[PDB]
Amino acid sequence: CHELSALRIAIGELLEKEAHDLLHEREELAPVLGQRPELKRLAEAKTLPALEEALREALLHLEERAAQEPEEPYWRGLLLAVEAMEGRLKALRAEAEALYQDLDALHGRLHRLFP
Structure with missing residues (x-):
């Protein structure tokens, strides 16, 4: 479940979880990061795109x-589980994206209602 841990870590950092909250996930992962660079990239991703990219790498493995x-x-159960989460991650990104775009229209809207 190294994929789930790494992913939980990145989401945790994004939510600024207290370090101890991610303790056991960093311990399980630590030993395999050598043989698996994508897991390291996944746990430390700082942007959604980079997060999804690292996750896609992990799904290949x-x-x-x-x-x-x-x-x-x-393994086939882990695949189905990681993929379900990928779906939710993409959903989270689409939401941020929607927010992003709507910020723009709103600005234009304020302009018109207050010439």
């Missing part, structure tokens, strides 16, 4: 692992 060990349904 997970996809590979699942194809290599077809007998263990756990």
Whole structure:
């Protein structure tokens, strides 16, 4: 579940969680970051785009692992879980995006209602 941890860390940083709150997630991840650079990039992503990009990288690795060990349904369960979350992450980004665009129109709207 290294993918879920790394992802929880990035969202945590974005929410400024107290360091101790992400303690065990950083401990589980620490040892595998060497063999997996994407996990490191994922945990430290600071922008949504970079977050999604690092996540896509992690899904490739997970996809590979699942194809290599077809007998263990756990990997296929992890894939489905990471993908569901990716969907929610994209949803969060679309929301920020919508907010972004609406900031612009509103500005134009104020101008017209107050010539």
